[PDB]
Specification:
The structure is cut from a larger assembly and holds chains A (49 residues), B (626 residues) and C (797 residues). With 49 residues, chain A is low in regular secondary structure. Chain A has no helices and one strand. Chain A is elongated, with a radius of gyration of 23 Å. Chain A starts with 41 loop residues before the first strand and ends in a 6-residue tail after the last strand. Chain B is mainly β. Chain B has a four-stranded antiparallel β-sheet with strand order 1-26-25-24, with no helix packed on it. The radius of gyration of chain B is 32 Å and the shape is elongated. Classes of the chains: A little secondary structure (49), B mainly beta (626), C mainly beta (797). At the B-C interface, strand 50 and strand 53 of B face strand 32 and strand 36 of C. Chain B: This is Intraflagellar transport protein 122 homolog.
């Protein structure tokens, strides 16, 4: 049904660049045993000379 | 820390009234490290890295002039020999074939050749001499020669295989691409001698050009030519620069006839050797790391070539410094790193520093790091099971001491034959002077500003020190020197080790040699029963109780600590915990009917079967409470 | 690891299916058809509640067709970060969809199409923010997620394959002629790869551009590319021949794998442990569609063959990697995979589970108590093998750089005890009650760690020589006589044998070593000496030994199962059929009954008489008296917040005999219960009968059961009990005798007379509860002071 029907990526002649909704973002939650990987935390030294 | 010479070969064939000399200019080193190359006037020398001998006889007559540079191809299959005969040869190499080395392709410039470089990826050759620079590609076999306005001195290819850097004695440093176009040009006022590219690193992943100018300065340049602003100054003019594998170290040579080591930031660590002449070329041995391999990799290998005609080999060994107080083990990782490990969950915590750490001492929920002329202290949040380290205080005062310790609101430093007490602010507080060098010190618990300690001297006399007393208390006397001391849980006995690996047990109430043992490496007291002694020799660890035969285990390692039903064994730089069965001691105590001590031993976490056993004998022998 | 088949989705409209993409976060499998038939749908759950679904699922949740097309579709890709779905056709029409919160409705959100050009392969960035589109002409267009074109460059050489780095900073291109080029993110050429895989097929003079087309290039995401010490993660395969595997783009020491199969698609694991190569094989004499699984090192773990004599096109993995979808002709086959899943179960209730990290080099071992719900964690760098005993577990790890393997013992907590080092490769490890035996390809090593009856042979003092706790190591073909104590430098491994060993089994006094050619050697534990040589037609795979050493089970490599009766220098094969078996376990108490697990179905078999199957998606832990324990490790891996409950993971299944015994106990009377239970005469049945008898306030039956069980302590207990007056003190003393005290305290409280409860608590030895009870209760000073002194002593000790 082509809700928008617009050419993008500079494929056509007339500039008809279109906007994509990027609100709904789906992320992966790290496993708990995978979350124990960060036991080796890096601590920098205070270098204020 | 320790630097040891391995093998030295001297070439004394000085030829007066002849332009051929005995100097050595460059020393090419193989990626694997099983073979080494050197260049002398009218000759090329091949050596074995581990032992000093000529695997192949010296080749003469191939080039009628001196040899300026020798380099591998990062794969151990090719040589490039540039000579003052205005010619560069490339030779094929393979150890297994009957002709080990043979010329492959020869080309010539218009003038003398001065420097050469290889491509890590495509194995292309870039040779620059006076008035000309040429590029050689193995596939096409067609060289590209181009003219320039003054003689290039040094060349170096980037580790990505894309960029190229060259320097000129007129002060011009040029950065080009594989197409040899003027990507970047920088003009200086002093000659350019040594350049290199920082190795790729997952932490950094950016390549910069490190160039040492003759105005006593070392400079870092970006790809676009914009300086990073470091411009670190030097006392002596640098000559050669080499980066170790993975970009961890930097070997610098030049004036003052000294070969020194530095961190990539610029922190001085050690000086390798002083030959008493200019060192033309110094090289580091690359290492190959397996997938997930475990190794300390403390060993380092350097090869030096001097002006008089000595090609020397040196080995660098890093000592181990560590601290263990309770539930924590803080040991020095690869230089300028501290790793704290817990024996329960084997979890590690890393602290990264820029300067070299000299001593690590950990007190109750407090760790002390002794950087060069700097002191850091970190505390711990006790409520959380995981530790959180925050810098409560920092000390800028420069202090030199082979042994450093931290106690509640105070610090102790041992230097030569003196012990200095430092406040947390930094100002010196008290001094103690002894006859000979203080070898080992042990700290015992106590009230703040009132912590006592034990001190052993090179003469052997064991002394006691209190913070406020300012008067040493002579504990005892020993004829041989003292290396390590330990105190019992109740402070009833004391174990002392001499230089001959002899262990002696002295009673504090009466000064008598109750126990003597030969060939002992380390020893430890129990912290709960006050009587068990665990001493580890080179191969076997023995646990001894009061008037009991020793228990043998044939466990590989050295004993560091003893806890209730736990012994700590350290191998190389990794640590492990091993449980012990108390059934033998329980049985022996049941033999002589001292049920109280037997119950105390069985309280150390013994299996329930021994518990019911001991209860049975306690009921039998009319002891209802036990 | 094992693979088998599952539900088979039928044809949509009798059309060829050639592209299937499986989402990783939410399960939305999308398949393309022939006449513009695109279908995205949800798949059924592998496991539901704690039993089989009465409805058996059987419901396609979405199953909606999004045609919009007149031509065919052969490129369908899912964007993992968002809901976008990209699909193209043969006419160069790129269409991107998105999900709207309505009645499972998808509407186009990108409609672009470039004429007079042919699309070859589109690709999405691992971060999901960049899309690369390429054509046969050579033009490469890179775009964001918004719609602003990054750059549209033109390349002289033709292109065939496109690949994205994990960091999205560099590009890998492959030409139809066959060669790999690396470019920057700004379309700038860096270098060309050199291929060592294609040997004797390429032109000897020039190797950069052979005449073999590229099949598939795959780079595993989440993998380091600026390092050299890591398992390989980049694979390049050709149309038919060798596949080449790299740890980095600049590597020059390849890993080669050779397969006799027409490679078309190679896909990596979600965790990167194994990768699957699909295609057609002619080894069977004709064309057979097969999918081969290979490890990160490359070992050809398994090969799955579809029933149809046709081609397998396209492979997709699930988010968790437990299921795989193949588009074969007009159907979407679903293959179920059970991985190795290194786990160990003790007899004390502690379960040790090994979990692989994303680094693929380091592992975490978890010790979970099934009773107290205590969880302990340890981190082990390298893991080779894990085994369990009644009260101890054996861990076999590898040290890299010394070619050595360390075996160590750990208790329930996990404290190492008596760790040893060997130079023998652990091909197959086992460990009995009193020994640990590890077998390499050609060597056998045995170690005694317990004494003859029950002791630890590590802290011993008597005479000088070694009596107990000695290590032996010998060779398989010759040197049948056991050797003396070896060393990590004295012992030699170089000699090799023509007949390698596959599986080893151990018992209390017997040892069995299998051979690939079909020979089984028997050894005695007091002094190792060969006695018998059993013959089997096919090479064994798993192998299992019965209690008392009377029978054994042989599982072939193809999955076939049979029963072998061990007799002096003989061979008796009991006919049992039951092909395609996976797991077999003999009972440690009953000499005959056993359990075998076949294609997600369990069977309890006694005297060659199987029973009804039960659907189960778990692994068998142990088979105790008329009971089998199973634990769902997949749910353990998928724990949301960090709490493990014994009522959700652990399940117990009772045998039909025990069920019938409980049935007849609960409906019928006591005397016929005794009469029917005398024949079996088992400890568990007597125990349960006695518990039932005492629960009903019956002592004659209880004392009879205890007398039959030969338990003196329980008889003393009952004798002490019988001299009681009230009807409630007996209940309380019995219930506090069993294992539980809180209900006894409550019944004391409702009966009142609290000093009885105080006396019970003080004799039981719990002092904190006594102190809590005394406080603000009566105010008597003397017993409070005594209890506080006792509690202080308890804390001090």
């Amino acid at each position: 049904m082509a809700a928008k029907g617009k050419q993008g990526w500079g494929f056509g002649g007339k500039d008809q660049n279109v906007k994509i909704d990027t609100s709904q973002q789906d992320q992966k939650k790290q496993n708990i045993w995978e979350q124990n990987n960060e036991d080796l935390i890096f601590v920098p030294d205070l270098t204020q000379e | 820390m320790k630097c040891s010479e391995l093998w030295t070969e001297i070439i004394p064939k000085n030829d007066p009234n002849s332009n051929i000399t005995n100097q050595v200019w460059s020393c090419s080193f193989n990626n694997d490290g099983s073979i080494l190359l050197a260049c002398v006037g009218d000759a090329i020398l091949v050596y074995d890295s581990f032992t000093g001998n000529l695997v192949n006889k010296a080749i003469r007559g191939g080039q009628k002039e001196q040899i300026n540079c020798i380099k591998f191809s990062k794969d151990g299959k090719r040589f490039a020999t540039a000579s003052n005969d205005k010619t560069v040869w490339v030779w094929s190499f393979d150890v297994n074939k009957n002709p080990k080395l043979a010329p492959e392709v020869k080309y010539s410039h218009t003038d003398k050749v001065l420097c050469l470089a290889f491509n890590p990826l495509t194995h292309q050759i870039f040779s620059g001499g006076a008035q000309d620079y040429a590029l050689w590609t193995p596939d096409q076999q067609s060289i590209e020669k181009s003219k320039f306005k003054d003689k290039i001195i040094t060349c170096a290819w980037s580790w990505d295989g894309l960029y190229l850097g060259f320097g000129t004695m007129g002060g011009i440093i040029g950065i080009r691409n594989r197409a040899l176009e003027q990507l970047a040009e920088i003009q200086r006022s002093f000659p350019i001698w040594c350049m290199d590219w920082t190795p790729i690193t997952p932490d950094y992943q950016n390549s910069v050009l490190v160039v040492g100018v003759w105005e006593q300065s070392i400079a870092h340049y970006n790809i676009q030519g914009q300086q990073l602003g470091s411009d670190k100054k030097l006392t002596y003019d640098p000559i050669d620069i080499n980066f170790s594998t993975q970009g961890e170290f930097l070997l610098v040579s030049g004036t003052n006839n000294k070969c020194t080591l530095y961190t990539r930031e610029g922190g001085f660590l050690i000086d390798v050797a002083t030959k008493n002449d200019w060192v033309w070329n110094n090289k580091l041995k690359p290492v190959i790391k397996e997938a997930g391999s475990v190794a300390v990799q403390d060993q380092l290998h350097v090869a030096l070539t001097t002006n008089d005609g000595e090609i020397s080999m040196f080995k660098i060994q890093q000592l181990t410094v560590h601290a263990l107080e309770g539930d924590k083990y803080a040991y020095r990782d690869n230089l300028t790193d501290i790793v704290v490990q817990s024996m329960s969950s084997n979890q590690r915590i890393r602290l990264k520093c820029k300067e070299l750490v000299k001593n690590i001492s950990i007190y109750k929920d407090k760790l002390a790091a002794h950087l060069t002329e700097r002191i850091l202290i970190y505390g711990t949040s006790s409520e959380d099971s995981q530790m959180k380290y925050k810098l409560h205080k920092r000390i800028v005062k420069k202090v030199e001491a082979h042994i450093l310790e931290i106690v509640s609101n105070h610090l102790i430093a041992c230097v030569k034959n003196k012990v200095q007490l430092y406040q947390l602010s930094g100002d010196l507080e008290k001094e103690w002077v002894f006859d000979s060098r203080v070898n080992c010190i042990k700290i015992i618990g106590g009230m703040p500003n009132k912590e006592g300690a034990y001190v052993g001297l090179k003469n052997g006399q064991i002394f006691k020190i209190f913070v406020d007393n300012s008067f040493p208390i002579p504990i005892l006397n020993h004829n041989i020197s003292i290396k390590n001391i330990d105190a019992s849980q109740k402070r009833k006995r004391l174990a002392v080790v001499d230089k001959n690996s002899n262990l002696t047990v002295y009673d504090l109430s009466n000064k008598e040699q109750v126990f003597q043992e030969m060939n002992i490496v380390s020893c430890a007291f129990n912290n709960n029963f006050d009587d068990l002694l665990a001493f580890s020799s080179t191969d076997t660890t023995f646990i001894r109780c009061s008037n009991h035969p020793p228990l043998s285990q044939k466990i590989s390692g050295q004993v560091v600590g003893f806890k209730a039903n736990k012994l700590f064994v350290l191998n190389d730089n990794v640590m492990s915990t091993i449980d012990v069965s108390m059934t033998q001691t329980m049985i022996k105590y049941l033999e002589r009917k001292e049920f109280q001590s037997a119950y105390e031993i069985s309280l150390l976490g013994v299996t329930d079967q021994d518990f019911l056993y001991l209860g049975n004998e306690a009921l039998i022998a009319t002891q209802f409470a036990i | 690891m094992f693979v088998f088949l599952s539900k088979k989705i039928g044809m949509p409209n009798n059309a060829k299916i050639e592209a299937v993409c499986w989402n990783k976060e939410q399960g939305w499998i999308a398949a393309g058809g022939e006449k513009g038939i695109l279908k995205v749908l949800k798949i059924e759950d592998q496991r539901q509640k704690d039993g089989s679904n009465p409805t058996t699922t059987g419901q396609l949740l979405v199953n909606n067709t999004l045609e919009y097309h007149t031509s065919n579709v052969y490129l369908v890709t899912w964007n993992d970060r968002y809901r976008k779905l990209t699909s193209v056709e043969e006419n160069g029409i790129i269409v991107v969809w998105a999900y709207f919160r309505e009645l499972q409705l998808w509407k186009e959100e990108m409609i672009n199409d470039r004429k007079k050009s042919v699309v070859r392969d589109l690709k999405w960035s691992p971060d999901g923010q960049k899309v690369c589109i390429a054509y046969e002409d050579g033009a490469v267009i890179v775009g964001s997620v918004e719609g602003s074109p990054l750059w549209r460059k033109e390349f002289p050489h033709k292109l065939a394959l496109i690949e994205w780095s994990p960091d999205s900073k560099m590009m890998i291109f492959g030409t139809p002629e066959g060669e790999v080029r690396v470019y920057d993110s700004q379309g700038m050429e860096m270098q060309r790869l050199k291929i060592h895989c294609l040997q004797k097929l390429i032109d000897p003079s020039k190797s950069f551009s052979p005449d073999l087309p590229l099949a598939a290039i795959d780079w595993f995401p989440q993998a380091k590319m600026y390092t050299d010490d890591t398992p390989p993660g980049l694979c390049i395969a050709y149309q038919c021949g060798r596949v080449q595997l790299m740890k980095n783009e600049k590597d020059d020491e390849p890993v080669l794998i050779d397969t006799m199969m027409k490679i078309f698609t190679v896909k990596w694991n979600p965790s990167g442990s194994m990768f699957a190569i699909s295609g057609t094989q002619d080894e069977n004499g004709e064309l057979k569609g097969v999918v081969q699984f290979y490890s990160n090192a490359g070992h050809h773990l398994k090969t799955l063959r579809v029933p149809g004599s046709d081609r397998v096109t396209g492979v997709s993995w699930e988010g968790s990697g437990l299921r795989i979808a193949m588009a074969v002709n007009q159907a979407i086959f679903f293959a179920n995979i059970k991985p190795d899943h290194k786990w160990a179960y003790m007899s004390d209730g502690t379960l040790a589970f090994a979990y692989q990290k994303i680094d693929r080099v380091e592992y975490t071992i978890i010790f979970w108590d099934t009773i107290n719900n205590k969880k302990n964690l340890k981190f082990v760098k390298n893991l080779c093998c894990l085994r369990a005993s009644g009260d101890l577990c054996c861990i076999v790890t590898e040290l890299i750089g010394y070619d050595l393997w360390q075996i160590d013992l750990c208790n329930s907590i996990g404290s190492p005890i008596d760790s040893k080092q060997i130079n023998i490769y652990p091909n197959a490890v086992t460990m009995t009650k009193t020994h640990i035996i590890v077998c390499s390809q050609d060597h056998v090593y045995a170690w005694q760690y317990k004494n003859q009856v029950e002791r630890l042979t590590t802290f011993e003092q008597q005479t000088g020589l070694r009596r107990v706790g000695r290590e032996q190591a010998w060779f398989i073909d010759k040197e049948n006589d056991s050797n003396n104590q070896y060393d990590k430098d004295t012992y030699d491994v170089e000699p090799q044998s023509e007949d390698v060993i596959c599986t080893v089994a151990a018992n209390e006094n017997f040892l069995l070593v299998a051979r690939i050619s079909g020979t089984i050697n028997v050894y005695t534990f007091p002094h190792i000496s060969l006695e018998n040589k059993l013959h089997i037609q096919t090479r064994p795979s798993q192998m299992s030994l019965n209690k008392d050493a009377t029978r054994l089970a042989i599982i072939d490599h193809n999955g076939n199962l049979n029963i072998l009766k061990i007799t002096p220098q003989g061979d008796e094969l009991l006919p049992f059929e039951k092909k395609e078996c996976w797991f077999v376990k003999y009972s440690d108490d009953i000499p005959e009954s056993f359990v075998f697990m076949e294609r997600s179905r369990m069977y309890i078999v006694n005297d060659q008489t199987p029973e009804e199957p039960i659907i189960t998606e778990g692994y068998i832990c142990q088979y105790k008296d008329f009971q089998v324990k199973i634990v769902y490790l997949d749910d353990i891996m998928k724990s949301p917040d960090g709490v493990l409950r014994k009522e959700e993971l652990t399940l117990e299944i009772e045998a039909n005999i025990l069920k019938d015994i409980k049935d007849q106990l609960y409906k019928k009377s006591m005397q016929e219960m005794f009469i029917v239970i005398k024949q079996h005469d088992n400890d568990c049945l007597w125990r349960v009968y006695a518990k039932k008898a005492l629960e009903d306030n019956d002592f004659d039956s209880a004392e009879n059961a205890f007398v039959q069980c030969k338990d003196y302590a329980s008889l003393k207990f009952l004798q002490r009990v019988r001299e009681l007056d009230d009807r409630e003190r007996q209940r309380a003393e019995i219930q506090c005798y069993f294992n539980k005290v809180e209900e006894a305290e409550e019944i004391y409280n409702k009966i009142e007379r609290r000093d009885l409860s105080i006396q019970m608590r003080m004799k039981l030895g719990d002092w904190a509860q006594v102190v809590d009870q005394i406080r603000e209760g009566t105010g008597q000073d003397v017993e409070l002071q005594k209890a506080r002194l006792e509690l202080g002593n308890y804390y001090a000790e």
